[PDB]
């Protein structure tokens, strides 16, 4: 069901730590996403998506 | 209580407080057989 | 935008400055425009654009006031980059858990 | 000139200089006896002297 | 989840997450997001035994 | 609706459609640039965020502006045209000459400040009744001498056209452009159109002080939200996100009361005298045990008697705090007394006056047991319980002994205490001050906060330290700029709500301005509530003392507006009557002779083309008579109504028709209206004055004595 291993291109071996790999892959590019404003003042930022 | 007002730590208290076991560490170990140094480009090396 | 387009059109295909970018080896056309075309708009300490842009290019050399207003974003970025990692680490720890 | 100040005065359940001084004294010195002499003295010795 | 069921809510979650990651210029394979989304819907609440 | 009007409406529709097309093009460009910036900005992170936020803010503004883009139009004496809307739209390739002016722009100031007597170089003012992207119709107003050739639903210009006009305009301008910012009272007689002046005054005041009222909000009080409707029409942002409307029955949040109360009960329940009654009634709940209570500690039997409860109540009442707060003093003293009695008998004869090491520990043990004791707490709840306004009033009305204790009259008896009326709402609101809260605190929320802050601290600890960095040079770290508490709060729900709904759900909210319509209906307690909910004393009050149907309504403005702002409120009364004919005015004056010996009425300076009419009703012909009348009138032209008691199916009760004007009115059987309580004469006066062009009367045997 998981299928090809992204790192090597072959079918995943029994015992792969797929969960931590997925977590790291999702979390690594988190710095490129836009975030809430860092300033303390102002109104709540939910008005603008 | 004993001396002062501090209570006496019971046996089960060895497994409950912030200090004890069943507890993880967010800080990492310091490991022997390790070193550190500046890196420079070696263009004659192979990928391994 | 128009100044950037004109600059992109003008440069010869074999000029090193634009050859470095077009080959994908390094950089992007925004940096080339800033270096040669014009710096453009800059932000206040609050993060809002200043109406008057920096019409000079680093090849020509910014004036005193243009440089002073430009320093705002440079100073802001140092703290912005440091603060950006906290949210990423938070989400990464959640996902790992 | 301001309605909010007049409203605060209307809702202020304190009358006279001595009572206000006693209130301030008991506020700043909750554990001390409510003597009038100290109640008058501390305020003068806190900011104005 | 209530209207369509567990299958469609997982597809919806994966689509929504990948939509943000695509719009922000990040490329992650759907399987990494699926690994995380699977863990979210592993329980069933009992209403009557 | 002349063909010229249709052509003008079509032209305005075409112009608004062009404006909307330009708006859609701008939206598309902004969205495309926003997507491109999010995807491949290629610059520094700060610059990318700045551009993205600017584009998102612009897109949100465009989204907000979609509903009702254009408000109205202004015509200058120079023949130039100005269009007022929610956004500023300018033609880039035509030297930026405006196609639409933001309502906040200085050039749009005359739209709100201009008046007929003192125009700001403007000839005519127009307003579009927008509905989505479509304009249903528009109303015109001449800022000068009336012409009589314009179109508007109110038809006020036509009536004015049919000096006296200069004097009326000057008086209206004097009312509208008053520089006062406190309590203002407007009371014009019937047919004077004081409603239009009130709406114009509200618009002017809200525009002038908009910058200091966009956060406090505006509260509209009255039978119908028509004032809120106008505020939304002319100030859609404030109306949509800042204006809250509450009928006098909806003062208490979440309790939509509609039932009325009899005059005998309402007249007393609406007076300030009830404040003493409420204070006495809650004091009654501070009762005593008729017989001693066996508290029955786990080891030694214990007894509470009437005298210890007496002393505890004396202490609690001495403290003077609200009921739920003096509960602490009452329970504390009762617990101390019971603990002393129990300790004296547990350590029989031994421990008395010994050092702290024994007596204090015994006291602590006894108090700890008491705090968990079920029957002791049940007893403490039997006398001096925790109270709520609903429970207090329900158990006050339903019992016949507590009313005598509280000093209330025998008239406000009712079998069911939970049948709330509009008169009970202010008492429910008031009782909150008397009762208060028992120092409520939350425990699960604190645990959640602690856990989240600890998780944020762990996240920060997970990051690399400065001691062992591997970068080429030292630099700012996250730990140097943010702490665990701030990081944890960064990911919480942070729920956000509109100001309108946010204030509507809060009892303690203080509003920036209060608008009251038909103010004569409000009683002393309603005014107390409203003045409690607006400490700035910024009020716009409209009504007529002679037209109240609520027996508890204000007898005069000075009786109501003098216990809060004595000598500071401004009063202005409009004089001339033009919205109604001379014959209707004479009939109204004839009815008015029964109210006051003098009753200075608004003189009429206009007469209708046809006089009123009256007829008898015999052998139950009203059923077909009303149908024939409405068929004849509605089919011809204009809006016609039938006014009478609900006993006739085809009658609109006076309670609903007060705030409307009609071309034709048919009042049926005025005797029944005159028999409707002490205010029957006022009801008939109102119904007769509703007529603007033609009035019909049906009576059983003879016309009322006055007529
Ligand atoms: Mg480096």
From Swiss-Prot, chain C:
Belongs to the RNA polymerase beta' chain family. The RNAP catalytic core consists of 2 alpha, 1 beta, 1 beta' and 1 omega subunit. When a sigma factor is associated with the core the holoenzyme is formed, which can initiate transcription. DNA-dependent RNA polymerase catalyzes the transcription of DNA into RNA using the four ribonucleoside triphosphates as substrates. This is DNA-directed RNA polymerase subunit beta'. It comes from Mycolicibacterium smegmatis (strain ATCC 700084 / mc(2)155). The lineage of its organism: Bacteria, Bacillati, Actinomycetota, Actinomycetes, Mycobacteriales. The gene is rpoC. The chain holds residues 782 to 878 of 1317 of the full protein.
UniProtKB/Swiss-Prot annotation, chain D:
Signal peptide: none annotated. Belongs to the RNA polymerase beta chain family. Mutations in the RRDR sequence (residues 423-449) confer rifampicin (Rif) resistance. Rif blocks transcription initiation but not elongation. The RNAP catalytic core consists of 2 alpha, 1 beta, 1 beta' and 1 omega subunit. When a sigma factor is associated with the core the holoenzyme is formed, which can initiate transcription. Interacts with RbpA, which partially restores Rif-inhibited transcription. DNA-dependent RNA polymerase catalyzes the transcription of DNA into RNA using the four ribonucleoside triphosphates as substrates. This subunit often mutates to generate rifampicin (Rif) resistance. Interaction with RbpA partially restores Rif-inhibited transcription; once the subunit is Rif-resistant however RbpA no longer stimulates transcription. This is DNA-directed RNA polymerase subunit beta. It comes from Mycolicibacterium smegmatis (strain ATCC 700084 / mc(2)155). The gene is rpoB. The chain holds residues 245 to 293 of 1169 of the full protein.
């Amino acid at each position: 069901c998981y299928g090809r291993s992204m790192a090597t291109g072959k079918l995943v071996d029994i015992g792969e730590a797929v969960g931590i790999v997925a977590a790291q892959s999702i979390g690594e590019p988190g710095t490129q996403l836009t975030m809430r404003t860092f300033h303390q003042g102002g109104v709540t930022g939910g008005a603008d998506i | 209580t004993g001396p002062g007002n501090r209570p006496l730590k019971s046996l089960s208290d060895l497994l409950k407080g912030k200090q004890g076991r069943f507890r993880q560490n967010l800080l990492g170990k310091r490991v022997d057989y390790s070193g550190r140094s500046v890196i420079v480009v070696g263009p004659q090396l192979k990928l391994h | 935008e128009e100044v950037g387009k004109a600059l992109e059109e003008f440069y010869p295909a074999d000029n090193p400055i634009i050859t470095i970018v077009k080959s994908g080896a390094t950089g992007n056309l925004t940096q080339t425009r800033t270096l040669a075309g014009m710096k453009g708009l800059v932000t206040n300490p609050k993060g809002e654009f200043i109406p008057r842009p920096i019409k000079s290019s680093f090849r020509e050399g910014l004036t005193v006031l243009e440089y002073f207003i430009n320093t705002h974003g440079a100073r802001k970025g140092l703290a912005d980059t440091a603060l950006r990692t906290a949210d990423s680490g938070y989400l990464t720890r959640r996902l790992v858990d | 000139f301001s309605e909010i100040m007049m409203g605060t005065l209307e809702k202020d359940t304190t009358s006279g200089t001595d009572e206000a001084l006693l209130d301030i004294y008991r506020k700043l010195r909750p554990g001390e006896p409510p003597t009038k002499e100290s109640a008058q003295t501390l305020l003068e010795n806190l900011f104005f002297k | 989840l209530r209207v369509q069921g567990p299958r469609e809510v997982q597809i919806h979650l994966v689509k929504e997450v990948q939509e943000v990651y695509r719009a922000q210029g990040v490329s992650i394979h759907d399987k990494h997001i699926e690994v995380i989304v699977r863990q979210m819907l592993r329980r069933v609440t009992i209403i009557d035994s | 609706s002349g063909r010229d009007y249709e052509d003008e409406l079509q032209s305005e529709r075409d112009y608004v459609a062009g404006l909307y097309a330009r708006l859609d093009a701008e939206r598309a460009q902004s969205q495309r640039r926003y997507a491109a910036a999010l995807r491949e900005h290629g610059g520094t992170a700060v610059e990318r965020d700045a551009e993205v936020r600017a584009l998102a803010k612009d897109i949100a503004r465009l989204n907000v502006a979609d509903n009702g883009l254009c408000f109205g139009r202004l015509d200058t004496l120079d023949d130039a045209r100005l269009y007022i809307g929610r956004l500023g739209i300018f033609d880039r390739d035509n030297d930026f000459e405006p196609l639409l002016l933001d309502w906040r722009a200085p050039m749009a100031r005359p739209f709100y400040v201009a008046t007929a007597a003192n125009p700001e170089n403007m000839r005519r003012r127009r307003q579009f009744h927008t509905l989505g992207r479509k304009v249903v119709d528009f109303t015109d107003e001449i800022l000068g001498r009336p012409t009589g050739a314009e179109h508007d639903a109110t038809n006020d210009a036509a009536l004015l056209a049919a000096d006296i006009v200069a004097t009326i305009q000057a008086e209206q301008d004097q009312v509208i452009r008053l520089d006062h910012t406190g309590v203002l009272v407007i009371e014009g007689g019937p047919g004077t159109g004081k409603t239009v002046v009130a709406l114009h005054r509200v618009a002017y005041l809200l525009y002038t002080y908009r910058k200091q009222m966009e956060r406090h909000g505006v509260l509209v009080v009255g039978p119908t939200p028509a004032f809120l409707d106008h505020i939304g029409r002319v100030l859609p942002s404030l109306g949509e996100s800042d204006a809250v409307f509450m009928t006098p029955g909806d003062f208490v949040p979440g309790l939509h009361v509609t039932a009325e109360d009899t005059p005998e009960a309402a007249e007393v329940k609406g007076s300030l005298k009830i404040l003493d009654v409420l204070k006495a009634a809650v004091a009654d709940r501070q009762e005593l045990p008729s017989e001693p209570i066996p508290i029955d500690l786990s080891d030694v039997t214990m007894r509470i008697d009437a005298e210890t409860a007496k002393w505890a109540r004396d202490e609690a009442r001495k403290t003077g705090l609200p009921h739920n707060e003096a509960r602490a003093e009452f329970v504390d003293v009762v617990t101390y007394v019971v603990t002393e009695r129990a300790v004296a008998r547990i350590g029989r004869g031994w421990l008395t006056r010994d050092d702290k090491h024994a007596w204090e520990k015994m006291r602590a043990d006894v108090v700890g047991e008491l705090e968990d004791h079920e029957q002791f707490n049940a007893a403490l709840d039997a006398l001096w319980p925790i109270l709520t306004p609903e429970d207090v009033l329900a158990q006050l009305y339903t019992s016949h002994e507590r009313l005598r204790a509280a000093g209330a009259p025998e008239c406000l008896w009712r079998a069911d205490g939970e049948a709330w009326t509009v008169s009970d709402v202010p008492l429910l609101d008031e009782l909150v001050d008397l009762l208060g809260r028992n120092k409520a605190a939350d425990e699960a929320a604190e645990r959640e906060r602690r856990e989240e802050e600890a998780y944020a601290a762990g996240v920060l600890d997970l990051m690399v330290d400065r001691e062992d960095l591997m970068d080429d040079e030292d630099h700012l770290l996250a730990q140097d700029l943010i702490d665990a508490e701030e990081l944890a709060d960064r990911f919480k729900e942070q729920d956000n709500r509109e100001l309108s709904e946010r204030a509507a759900a809060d009892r303690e909210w203080t509003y920036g301005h209060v608008v009251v319509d038909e103010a004569q209906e409000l009683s002393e307690m309603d005014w107390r509530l409203l003045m409690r909910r607006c400490p700035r004393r910024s009020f716009t009050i409209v009504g007529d003392l002679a037209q109240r149907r609520s027996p508890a309504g204000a007898r005069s403005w000075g009786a109501m507006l003098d216990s809060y702002v004595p000598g500071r409120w401004v009063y202005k009364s409009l004089s001339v009557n033009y919205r109604t004919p001379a014959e209707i005015m004479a009939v109204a004056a004839a009815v008015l002779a029964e109210f006051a010996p003098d009753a200075t009425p608004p003189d009429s300076v206009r007469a209708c083309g046809v006089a009123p009419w009256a007829r008898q009703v015999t052998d139950d012909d009203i059923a077909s008579a009303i149908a024939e009348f409405v068929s004849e009138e509605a089919g011809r032209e204009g809006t016609s109504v039938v006014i009478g008691p609900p006993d006739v199916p085809g009658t609109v009760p006076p309670s609903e028709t007060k705030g409307l004007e009609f071309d034709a009115v048919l009042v049926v059987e005025p005797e029944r209206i005159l028999a409707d309580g002490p205010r029957g004469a006022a009801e008939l006066y109102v119904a007769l004055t509703r007529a603007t062009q033609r009035l019909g009367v049906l009576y059983r045997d003879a016309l009322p004595q006055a007529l």
